[PDB]
Structure 1
Amino acid sequence: SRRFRYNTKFPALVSYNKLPWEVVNHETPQFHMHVAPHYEQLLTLAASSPVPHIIGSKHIDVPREHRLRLLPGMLYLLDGDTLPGEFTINRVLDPTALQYYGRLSSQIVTVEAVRMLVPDDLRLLCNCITFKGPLHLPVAPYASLASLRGASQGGSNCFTLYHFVRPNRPPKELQLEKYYIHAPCVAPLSEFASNSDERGNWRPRLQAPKRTRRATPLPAYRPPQSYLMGLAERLAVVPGGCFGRRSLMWGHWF
C-alpha cells in the first residue's frame, strides 16, 4: 500500500526561508552583523592578490528582467559614490548597526557612509559602503586595489563597495565564502630582498645572549574578596567565559 513504502523516519521539514525567527531582516542591526566581517576579509584579499572581477569601471548592466536572477550574490568595487538607478536610498544612521564596521574602519579604510538600496519592487537590496582612502594595509603592486585610484592615492580618494542580496532570507544567503583565500603579505620580507637597500643593514643573531639576571618576579598574588560563582572547571565555563578549553583552566581567580 501507500503506507508501506518507507517508514516515518526523517520526514519532510519546513525550510528556514519561511520561518521568521530564522530570517534576518535588513532594517535590524543583525543584518550588518553577518555581512561586515565578510567585507574586512575581502579587502584583505584584494590588497594582497589580484582578484578578477572585484573592480569594474561601471555598474554591471544586466537587463531589467534578468536583474533579480543574476545580481544577488555578486560584488564589485567602483570608484566614487555613484549609485545605481531604480533604487531608493536609505542611509544607515543607526549606531547599533554602524558599530559592526569598527574593525573595517580602523584597521582598513575609513567607512564614510553605509547605504541600503531598496528597489521599486522591494526584492533586491544593495549594501553600499563608501570608503575613504588610503588603506592602512600595505597594498601589493600586483593586487587588485592597485588598479583603483582611491585606494592607491593618499572626492578623489573615495571608492564604494556594492553587495547585492535578497531581502528576507536566512543568513546563509548573505555569505561570501569564495573570497576566503588567504594570500600572504610580504611586507616583513621585502626588507631583506634584493629589491631593498636595507638588506645589508640588519645584523643576524645566531646565538642567545648570556643572561646574568633572571626574569622579574610577578607581584604578590592577592586572592579575591567577592563571592565567586564556583569552580569554572566543572561548570563547563571556558577560562574567562570568552575562549579556551574547560580542561585547561587558566586566567580565572585561581
Structure 2
Amino acid sequence: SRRFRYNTKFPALVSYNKLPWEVVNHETPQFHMHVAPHYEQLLTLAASSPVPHIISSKHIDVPREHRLRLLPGMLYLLDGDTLPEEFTINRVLDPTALQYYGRLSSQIVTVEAVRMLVSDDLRLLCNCITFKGPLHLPVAPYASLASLRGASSNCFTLYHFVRPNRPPKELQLEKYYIHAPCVAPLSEFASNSDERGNWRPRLQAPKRTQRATPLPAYRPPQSYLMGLAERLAVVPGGCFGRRSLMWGHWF
C-alpha cells in the first residue's frame, strides 16, 4: 500500500556533491590544499619504486569525445614543460594557494610553476606543476623516476586531471600510495659499498661516570591560563597527543 512497504528511518538524502558548501572550487587555495600532499607522496613513491604508467610520451591522446570521460582522475609526469591542447591556461600567483607546495618545493623538488588548464568547454580541469633541478631525495636506479632526464632541459612537469566543482573525494590519489622503502642507510654496509669495513660496531654501551645535565630551573607561568587542558579536553598544546596524557602544556 506504498506506505507500509518499508520503514522511514533512513530516507534518501540529497547527494553530497550538489551542496555548494561541500564542493571545492578550483579558483580558491582550498583546492591546492587538498592535492599538494598527494603530489608529495606520489613523488616519494616514484623516487623509490617503479610505478607503471607515470612516465609517458607527449600526452595521452584519447578522442575528443572520450576525453572528459576517461581522462579525469588520471595523472602522469613528463620531461620538459609542454602544455596539452585545447586548454585555457591560468597561472596561479596567489600566495595563499602557493603556500601549500612549500613542503613539496623544499623537501622533494623545487617547484617552478603551478597552472590550472581549463577545458574550452569548462568541464574538465588539469592541475599541472613544473619542477626544476634534481630531486632532494635519493633516487633508486630502478625507480621509474630515474627514467626521467629532467630529474637526477632540467625541468619536468606533472599533470593531474580532475572534474571541476566536485567534493574533495575527486582530488584523491589512493592507488599511488604504497610505501616502498628507500635504502640509504644500508648501502654503506652492503657489499656494493667499498666503505664497508670502515665502520666499527658498538656492541657495548660505554661506561658512564657523568649523569645527564639537569634542566634549567622550572619557572611557573605568570599569565592567566584558560584552565586545565585535560579537563577542557584540549590535546597537549592543542597540537597532538591524548587528553588523558597531559604533557608539554603549562606545568
TM-score range normalised by the length of the shorter chain? over 0.9
Equivalent pairs, count: 251
Q: Deviations over 1:105-141 (max 9, x none)?
A: 0001100100000011101100010000200000000
Runs (4+) off by over 3 Å: none
1:80 correspondence with 2:50: no
Cα distance, 1:247 vs structure 2 = 0.3
Q: Deviations over 1:214-250 (max 9, x none)?
A: 0000000000000000000110000010000000000
Cα distance, 1:70 vs structure 2 = 0.3
Cα distance, 1:57 vs structure 2 = 1.9
Inter-partner Cα distance in structure 2 for 1:142 and 1:225:
58
Inter-partner Cα distance in structure 1 for 2:165 and 2:210:
64
Instruction: Give the aligned partner of residue 163 of structure 1.
Output: 160
Partner-residue secondary structure (3-state), 1:36:
helix
Q: Deviations over 1:184-237 (max 9, x none)?
A: 010100010000011100000000000010000000000000000000011000
1:187 correspondence with 2:184: yes
Percent identity at matched positions?
Answer: 98
Inter-partner Cα distance in structure 2 for 1:194 and 1:216:
41
Inter-partner Cα distance in structure 1 for 2:5 and 2:170:
35
Q: Give the root-mean-square deviation of aligned CA atoms.
A: 0.5
Inter-partner Cα distance in structure 2 for 1:23 and 1:169:
5
Cα distance, 1:179 vs structure 2 = 1.0
Partner-residue secondary structure (3-state), 1:161:
strand
Partner-residue secondary structure (3-state), 2:22:
coil
Cα distance, 1:58 vs structure 2 = 1.4
Q: Deviations over 1:16-74 (max 9, x none)?
A: 11000000000000000000000000000000000000010210000000000000010
TM normalised by structure 1 equals 0.98
Inter-partner Cα distance in structure 2 for 1:244 and 1:71:
41
1:203 correspondence with 2:220: no
Q: Which runs of 5+ in 1 are unaligned?
A: none
Q: Deviations over 1:132-172 (max 9, x none)?
A: 020000000000111000112xxx11000000000010000
Instruction: Give the aligned partner of residue 54 of structure 1.
Output: 54
Q: Deviations over 1:78-121 (max 9, x none)?
A: 01110001000000000000000000000011001000000111
Partner-residue secondary structure (3-state), 1:128:
strand
Partner-residue secondary structure (3-state), 1:69:
helix
Inter-partner Cα distance in structure 2 for 1:185 and 1:119:
38
Instruction: Give the aligned partner of residue 234 of structure 1.
Output: 231
Inter-partner Cα distance in structure 2 for 1:246 and 1:184:
33
